[PDB]
Scaffold this active site. Structure first.
Site, PDB file in Angstrom:
ATOM      1  N   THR A  79      -6.316 -16.592   5.155  1.00 46.43           N
ATOM      2  CA  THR A  79      -5.150 -16.205   4.746  1.00 46.43           C
ATOM      3  C   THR A  79      -4.413 -16.581   2.788  1.00 46.43           C
ATOM      4  OG1 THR A  79      -4.633 -15.384   6.942  1.00 46.43           O
ATOM      5  CG2 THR A  79      -2.873 -15.084   4.953  1.00 46.43           C
ATOM      6  N   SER A  98       4.960 -11.894   6.027  1.00 47.02           N
ATOM      7  CA  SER A  98       3.375 -10.857   6.392  1.00 47.02           C
ATOM      8  C   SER A  98       2.334 -12.451   7.485  1.00 47.02           C
ATOM      9  CB  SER A  98       2.304 -10.227   5.032  1.00 47.02           C
ATOM     10  OG  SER A  98       1.918 -11.614   4.300  1.00 47.02           O
ATOM     11  N   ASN A  99       0.928 -11.572   7.075  1.00 45.29           N
ATOM     12  CA  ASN A  99       0.738 -12.741   8.361  1.00 45.29           C
ATOM     13  C   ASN A  99       0.440 -12.783   9.371  1.00 45.29           C
ATOM     14  OD1 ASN A  99      -2.604 -12.699   9.205  1.00 45.29           O
ATOM     15  ND2 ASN A  99      -1.813 -14.886   8.228  1.00 45.29           N
ATOM     16  N   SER A 156     -10.311   1.755   3.057  1.00 41.97           N
ATOM     17  CA  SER A 156     -10.383   0.830   1.023  1.00 41.97           C
ATOM     18  C   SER A 156      -9.347   0.404   0.663  1.00 41.97           C
ATOM     19  CB  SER A 156     -12.017   1.360   1.604  1.00 41.97           C
ATOM     20  OG  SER A 156     -12.621   0.226   0.733  1.00 41.97           O
ATOM     21  N   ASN A 157      -9.262  -0.451   0.280  1.00 45.02           N
ATOM     22  CA  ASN A 157      -8.473  -0.608  -0.736  1.00 45.02           C
ATOM     23  C   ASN A 157      -8.783   0.372  -2.114  1.00 45.02           C
ATOM     24  OD1 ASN A 157      -5.773  -2.187  -0.322  1.00 45.02           O
ATOM     25  ND2 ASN A 157      -6.809  -3.203   0.455  1.00 45.02           N
ATOM     26  N   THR A 198       1.301  -3.860   3.901  1.00 45.14           N
ATOM     27  CA  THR A 198       1.367  -4.619   3.927  1.00 45.14           C
ATOM     28  C   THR A 198       0.277  -5.691   2.680  1.00 45.14           C
ATOM     29  OG1 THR A 198       0.388  -5.032   6.162  1.00 45.14           O
ATOM     30  CG2 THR A 198       0.112  -7.025   4.240  1.00 45.14           C
ATOM     31  N   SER A 245       0.909  -1.298   0.219  1.00 43.35           N
ATOM     32  CA  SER A 245      -0.185   0.429   0.246  1.00 43.35           C
ATOM     33  C   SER A 245       0.813   1.187  -0.252  1.00 43.35           C
ATOM     34  CB  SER A 245      -0.489   0.115   1.151  1.00 43.35           C
ATOM     35  OG  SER A 245      -2.240  -0.413   0.840  1.00 43.35           O
TER      36      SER A 245
HETATM   37  C1  LIG Z   1      -2.407  -2.400   2.009  1.00 45.10           C
HETATM   38  O1  LIG Z   1      -0.803  -2.355   1.734  1.00 45.10           O
HETATM   39  C2  LIG Z   1      -3.525  -3.064   2.079  1.00 45.10           C
HETATM   40  N1  LIG Z   1      -2.887  -4.266   2.443  1.00 45.10           N
HETATM   41  C3  LIG Z   1      -3.578  -4.935   2.292  1.00 45.10           C
HETATM   42  O2  LIG Z   1      -5.082  -4.113   2.137  1.00 45.10           O
HETATM   43  C4  LIG Z   1      -3.912  -6.486   2.730  1.00 45.10           C
HETATM   44  C5  LIG Z   1      -4.394  -7.043   1.766  1.00 45.10           C
HETATM   45  C6  LIG Z   1      -4.345  -8.697   2.549  1.00 45.10           C
HETATM   46  C7  LIG Z   1      -2.517  -9.006   3.143  1.00 45.10           C
HETATM   47  C8  LIG Z   1      -3.069 -10.345   4.158  1.00 45.10           C
HETATM   48  N2  LIG Z   1      -3.380 -10.751   5.197  1.00 45.10           N
HETATM   49  C9  LIG Z   1      -4.863 -11.876   5.437  1.00 45.10           C
HETATM   50  O3  LIG Z   1      -4.524 -12.521   4.437  1.00 45.10           O
HETATM   51  C10 LIG Z   1      -5.679 -11.484   6.444  1.00 45.10           C
HETATM   52  N3  LIG Z   1      -6.054 -12.756   6.246  1.00 45.10           N
HETATM   53  C11 LIG Z   1      -1.480 -10.741   4.089  1.00 45.10           C
HETATM   54  O4  LIG Z   1      -0.535 -11.452   3.751  1.00 45.10           O
HETATM   55  O5  LIG Z   1      -0.995 -10.206   6.052  1.00 45.10           O
HETATM   56  C12 LIG Z   1      -3.947  -2.193   3.349  1.00 45.10           C
HETATM   57  N4  LIG Z   1      -2.477  -1.421   3.640  1.00 45.10           N
HETATM   58  C13 LIG Z   1      -2.110  -1.667   5.295  1.00 45.10           C
HETATM   59  C14 LIG Z   1      -1.341   0.047   5.821  1.00 45.10           C
HETATM   60  O6  LIG Z   1      -1.960   1.407   5.146  1.00 45.10           O
HETATM   61  O7  LIG Z   1      -0.496  -0.099   6.818  1.00 45.10           O
HETATM   62  C15 LIG Z   1      -3.077  -2.280   5.937  1.00 45.10           C
HETATM   63  C16 LIG Z   1      -2.681  -2.795   7.151  1.00 45.10           C
HETATM   64  C17 LIG Z   1      -3.502  -0.742   6.329  1.00 45.10           C
HETATM   65  S1  LIG Z   1      -4.637  -2.958   4.187  1.00 45.10           S
END
Ligand SMILES: *C(=O)[C@@H](NC(=O)CCCC[C@H](NC(=O)CN)C(=O)O)[C@@H]1N[C@@H](C(=O)O)C(C)(C)S1
Length: 345
Positions: free
Chosen positions: A121, A324-325, A158-159, A299, A60
């Site tokens: 995830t 991540s996660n 929100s994306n 993330t 992001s």
């Molecule tokens: C930007 O980075 C954007 N990220 C997402 O929307 C995350 C997508 C899923 C990531 C995944 N999580 C899961 O699968 C959860 N079950 C993982 O790999 O962890 C948005 N930007 C951030 C940022 O601005 O900090 C956010 C966490 C707010 S969401």
């Protein structure tokens, strides 16, 4: 500013490894003096060590690149922040009263479709990783849900908002977002490690691999390196390096990327929490020592990014962990901002 604390930074990375990151790294550009630390592995199966020159997916942080392009379009008279999104993208949103400024500050109410996609995830990643979406496809997924608040009325990240951003860029310019990023940002700033290759899954050149942590505690890590990131696009698909994100946010904050008026609008803060704000595709974090820093987090599967600069751009910090996660790692990596900006206690 206080001196950056390298011993503190080293401990943050070491803690992140102890919590499940295969590798973790950080670069600080302190007004022309570099600090650079890394620990662990870029590829956990081969053992290749991670370094601060490894390319990675910034997630992001992409939104700040999108916002810069949009704010240059405002400077050029092609976009008005308080006009309706539907003025430019006819028929896109059912409420022709949602404005560009509301979208760019996450006040539009548009539902975040990724909450469908990633409820689980690893299954969710396996679902999207090799899919190609149009911009419209993602908007339609959001619009299956009603808005979560009236236009402008509430902050709700929100994306979908930065899917709208990419649609706006492409419509108003007649070019792809990759072309606009290249011409307006990557080339002028000489960001030689920064790319937007969507929908290609390859990360060009030497890179950190990404390791997605499964929902099952203790489960085996999933290599999530190669994916289209088509579910995010102008909300999440840039590839970069610590040096280049440092260069970018320093250039932003020091006033090199848009008019003073548009940078001011970018920094009109909507409250996120008691120590954070959101501007127009830009975050503010308030640190323990009474310093605020400016930039964005990311993330994306297998990669956590922090990229922040001081108000005048003279100190910038980019940190990456290739998992991540893993909330513990995410929270640990935030500590790089304290050590880099606030220094030794
Ligand atoms: C930007 O980075 C954007 N990220 C997402 O929307 C995350 C997508 C899923 C990531 C995944 N999580 C899961 O699968 C959860 N079950 C993982 O790999 O962890 C948005 N930007 C951030 C940022 O601005 O900090 C956010 C966490 C707010 S969401």
């Amino acid at each position: 500013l206080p001196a950056p604390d390298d011993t503190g930074l080293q401990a943050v990375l070491h803690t992140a490894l102890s919590q499940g990151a295969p590798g973790a790294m950080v670069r600080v550009d302190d007004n022309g003096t570099i600090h650079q630390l890394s620990e662990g592995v870029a590829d956990r199966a081969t053992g290749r060590a991670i370094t601060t020159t490894d390319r990675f997916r910034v997630g992001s942080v992409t939104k700040s690149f999108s916002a810069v392009v949009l704010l240059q379009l405002v400077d050029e008279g092609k976009l008005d922040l308080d006009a309706s999104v539907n003025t430019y993208l006819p028929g896109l949103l059912p409420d022709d009263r949602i404005t560009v400024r509301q979208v760019m500050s996450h006040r539009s109410g548009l539902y975040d479709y990724t909450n469908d996609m990633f409820a689980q995830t690893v299954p969710g990643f396996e679902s999207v990783r090799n899919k190609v979406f149009s911009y419209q496809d993602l908007i339609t997924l959001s619009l299956k849900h009603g808005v979560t608040n009236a236009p402008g009325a509430a902050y709700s990240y929100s994306n979908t908002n930065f899917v709208v951003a990419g649609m706006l860029i492409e419509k108003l310019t007649g070019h792809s977002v990759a072309t606009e990023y290249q011409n307006r940002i990557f080339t002028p700033l000489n960001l030689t490690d920064t790319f937007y290759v969507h929908p290609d899954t390859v990360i060009p050149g030497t890179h950190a691999n990404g390791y997605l942590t499964p929902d099952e505690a203790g489960g085996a890590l999933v290599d999530s390196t190669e994916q289209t990131v088509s579910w995010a696009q102008s909300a999440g698909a840039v590839i970069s390096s610590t040096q280049d994100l440092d260069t970018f946010f320093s250039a932003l904050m020091s006033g090199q990327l848009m008019s003073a008026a548009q940078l001011a609008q970018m920094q009109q803060w909507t409250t996120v929490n008691s120590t954070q704000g959101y501007g127009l595709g830009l975050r503010r974090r308030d640190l323990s020592c009474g310093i605020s820093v400016y930039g964005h987090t990311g993330t994306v599967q297998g990669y956590y990014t922090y990229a922040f600069a001081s108000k005048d751009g003279k100190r910038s910090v980019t940190a990456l962990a290739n998992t991540s996660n893993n909330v513990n790692v995410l929270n640990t990596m935030a500590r790089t901002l304290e050590s880099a900006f606030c220094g030794k206690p």
